[PDB]
Amino acid sequence: RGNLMGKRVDFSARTVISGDPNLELDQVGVPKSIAKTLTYPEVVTPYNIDRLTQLVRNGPNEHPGAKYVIRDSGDRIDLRYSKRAGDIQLQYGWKVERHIMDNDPVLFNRQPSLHKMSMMAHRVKVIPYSTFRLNLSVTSPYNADFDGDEMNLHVPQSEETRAELSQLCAVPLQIVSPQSNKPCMGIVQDTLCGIRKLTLRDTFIELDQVLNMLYWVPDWDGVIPTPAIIKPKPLWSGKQILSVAIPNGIHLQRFDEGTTLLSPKDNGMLIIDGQIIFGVVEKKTVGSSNGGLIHVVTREKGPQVCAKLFGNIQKVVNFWLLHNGFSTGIGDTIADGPTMREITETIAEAKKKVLDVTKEAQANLLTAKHGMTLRESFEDNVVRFLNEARDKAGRLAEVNLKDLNNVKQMVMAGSKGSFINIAQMSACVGQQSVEGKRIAFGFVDRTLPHFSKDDYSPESKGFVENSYLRGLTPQEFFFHAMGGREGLIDTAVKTAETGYIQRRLVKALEDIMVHYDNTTRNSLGNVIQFIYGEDGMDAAHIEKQSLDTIGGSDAAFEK
């Protein structure tokens, strides 16, 4: 396992990764110092004699340069210590081990590397500074961020593996994963938040910014679209500019709840011939979702066009968001006075319900739910009352949030956060649970030495009535910490156990392959399936479709 199944290899590099909005999806930024250490042995031909000669003359201390010369006899010449006799005369069939240049295909990997999209092939882009640089849309397949993560680079050494790498493992070929027959990459973060803001109906752009936005799309045909508003002032809508990045001939239609041809809430999606008709562009369109824009483009026009779609959308949206701006502060977590009063009484009503059930239970008039003990039924009622109280309070807080609220904006775009985050920050953190139960009596008949024995009120067993904005009380702080410790322990243990499960699964199925007779067989030749998947298709080409004959009434079927 340590020396044969895996081993340390030559011609590799490791460093911290950074995010570059100005790199293509399949490009990787390589530090210049690394590019000077890593080399590719290129064979001398009539097509490269002059270029290789200049690289040899440059020497090993100037990129683009070279480090070694290998003759047809197998002798290797270090270009250091070799200038004494002058520049060497190259001959056909020789090899020049030269610095990895731009557009060289390289394998780019992040460990643990739990699936094949964690090793993908990128095109080299030699750059200043000491970090690797990659497009933001390829961070989800790698499960990578820029808090300090490091990634590994591997350089192929032959034309065989060099074409193999770029024709099988290239990033554009991995956009649609076969794990869940849906795209594994999509627009994320800033570009997901900006695209939602840019495609609102109120978003209008003037000539000067439109011209710059048009010029930022590399494949723009030089034709200025007619503004949506002609008089009294030429104004372009954000949908019109974002449509320039969408390749022509792409059609996409989606209906959300309440969506009609006249979309009163601007929800849903309607794209005809690459032009957005209505609908806000958010995660349901430009995300890694089934039937979205990326899925349609990569299947209709191909993977290379889809890769250009990633860059074009990112460039146009990033420019627009750079000059519009987007922030978030303490003011985005504050609900108005009336909302807090409604929230306070909502929690009070829930607490009164808890008091009502506790007092009837203490009177022995409560009947246990079928198949449950009296205490378990009582706890189930209390947790349900308190859980619904938090959700209702969060709903009250969320409804009060204005459309200009930045946290609300992020949630609507699908970029970050969710309803629960808003509820806990603004309305109520809620019930803390350890082992799927309320805080247990660590002390004799109480949770802390601050209550009285045999206390079952929500405040005693770990119900945080406050929000993060208002601050947890010392009892709530400790109970909240107890719940947090549960998550940290679960993260560690599950990480170790799932890792062993993954290895066991891989080793059990590693020798199974689809053969030229369409059968699925193992190394023994034993038939596992007589046709792969029982249909013979590849999951990367499967899409969800409706069978129109099975459903509906008989009369509709006849009609």
Partner: protein, 140 residues
């Protein structure tokens, strides 16, 4: 080129919704009782209030004499004459749906960069509205 549809409407109501610059207005024709209009208007550039009368025109081109991404848009130059000179609010968009509402009622859906319009009317007055690009001209 030539007008595909001209008519006068009385704005029944205006709805701002969640927007600060765009209002969806409901209007009905002054001469025909079967013609109604739903239109999204940038009211920051062309305010509209209820009880207002609007002259709505649809044309296939803005150049005066008949001439029936087409061509790169350029800023208007001094001495440029077009249909827009006679109106206050002008928009350019595409027709993306034709829906049969009744035996003789036909509805045409337009999109001006995301500002949606719906023109319902009898079959014999919206017969020149094709599935193409068109200009929408509004004069108070």
């Amino acid at each position: 080129s030539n007008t595909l549809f001209d008519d006068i409407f009385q704005v029944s109501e205006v709805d701002p919704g969640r927007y600060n610059k765009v209002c969806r207005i409901e209007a009905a024709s002054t001469t025909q009782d079967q013609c109604k209009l739903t239109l999204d208007i940038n009211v920051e550039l062309f305010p509209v209030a209820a009880q207002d009368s609007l002259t709505v025109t649809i044309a296939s081109s803005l150049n005066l004499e008949d001439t029936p991404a087409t061509r790169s848009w350029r800023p208007p130059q001094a001495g440029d004459r077009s249909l827009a000179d006679d109106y206050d609010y002008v928009m350019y968009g595409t027709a993306y749906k034709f829906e049969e509402v009744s035996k003789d009622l036909i509805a045409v859906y337009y999109s001006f960069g995301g500002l949606l319009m719906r023109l319902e009317g009898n079959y014999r007055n919206l017969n020149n509205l094709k599935q193409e690009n068109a200009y929408l001209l509004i004069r108070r």
